Amino acid sequence: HHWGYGKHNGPEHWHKDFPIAKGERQSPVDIDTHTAKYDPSLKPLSVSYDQATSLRILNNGHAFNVEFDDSQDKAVLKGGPLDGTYRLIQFHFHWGSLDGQGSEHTVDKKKYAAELHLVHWNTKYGDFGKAVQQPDGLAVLGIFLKVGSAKPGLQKVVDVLDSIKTKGKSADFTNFDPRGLLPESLDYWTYPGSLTTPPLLECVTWIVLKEPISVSSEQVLKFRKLNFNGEGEPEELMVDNWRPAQPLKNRQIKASFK
Numbered sequence: 144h145h146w147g148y149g150k151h152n153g154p155e156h157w158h159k160d161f162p163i164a165k166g167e168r169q170s171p172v173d174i175d176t177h178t179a180k181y182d183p184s185l186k187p188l189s190v191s192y193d194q195a196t197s198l199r200i201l202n203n204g205h206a207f208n209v210e211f212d213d214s215q216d217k218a219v220l221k222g223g224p225l226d227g228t229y230r231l232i233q234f235h236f237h238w239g240s241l242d243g244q245g246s247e248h249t250v251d252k253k254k255y256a257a258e259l260h261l262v263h264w265n266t267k268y269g270d271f272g273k274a275v276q277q278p279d280g281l282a283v284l285g286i287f288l289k290v291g292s293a294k295p296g297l298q299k300v301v302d303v304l305d306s307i308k309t310k311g312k313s314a315d316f317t318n319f320d321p322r323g324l325l326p327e328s329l330d331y332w333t334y335p336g337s338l339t340t341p342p343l344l345e346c347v348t349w350i351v352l353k354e355p356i357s358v359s360s361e362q363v364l365k366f367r368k369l370n371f372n373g374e375g376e377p378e379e380l381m382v383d384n385w386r387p388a389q390p391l392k393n394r395q396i397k398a399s400f401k
């Protein structure tokens with residue numbers, strides 16, 4: 144009886160195995176745009192993805208991860224609110240059953256159709272497993288998806304999904320350029336928070352871009368054909384794999400822009 148997104152094992156149950164679910168710095172959160180303060184001390188984000196080495200795509204039973212070679216500083220995030228160098232390890236998405244829900248963060252209570260998370264770990268801790276035990280161990284770059292025009296840079300991802308339909312399936316996924324998933328603007332909000340799935344560790348500097356990317360209805364429909372279940376098991380469509388907004392508590396969300 145493992146955690147998931149259903150009635151019986153979904154977010155409102157997670158606290159029983161993972162008591163930190165009710166913690167002081169849990170993610171995601173609603174971003175109230177009027178309350179978020181411009182911080183002129185914040186630097187522009189430095190997204191250095193030119194030398195990124197994608198390797199594989201994995202259906203892990205809760206989402207799909209596009210995995211990168213993080214054995215050296217190739218693809219890194221620095222600047223913004225961060226001190227030091229954060230290495231890209233994987234990206235994944237959260238999405239809905241319909242366009243009106245799917246994002247984890249919200250903006251003045253608005254839910255987007257989906258949310259991209261580019262996950263990075265602080266290289267001063269040496270490995271990812273060490274980093275997740277530190278308050279400044281991870282930096283997750285969050286990008287909203289709205290449904291409209293197709294995102295050309297996402298199509299390679301969409302087209303491989305048929306080959307990783309079920310939990311535990313993986314496929315070779317080399318030479319994928321995540322630059323193709325970014326919006327024009329790197330304006331962002333930032334706050335201290337957590338992983339949004341178990342083990343819900345409070346180890347993340349969140350950086351959420353203001354500008355959504357547009358994807359097509361056909362693109363997101365293909366996400367919704369994935370399966371939570373393993374091969375040969377009763378089909379459970381991988382939809383609504385998002386955690387709702389959590390209490391902000393004693394935290395401040397800062398804006399990089401006026």
Ligand SMILES: NS(=O)(=O)c1ccc(C(=O)N2CCCc3ccccc32)cc1
Nearest residue numbers: 260262275283337338339340341342343
């Ligand atoms: N949605 S997110 O961007 O906040 C996110 C969530 C979880 C993770 C993540 O590495 N996992 C989660 C589950 C298995 C696991 C086991 C031990 C340490 C970390 C992890 C990474 C990024």
Ligand SMILES: [Zn+2]
Nearest residue numbers: 235237260339
């Ligand atoms: Zn995520």
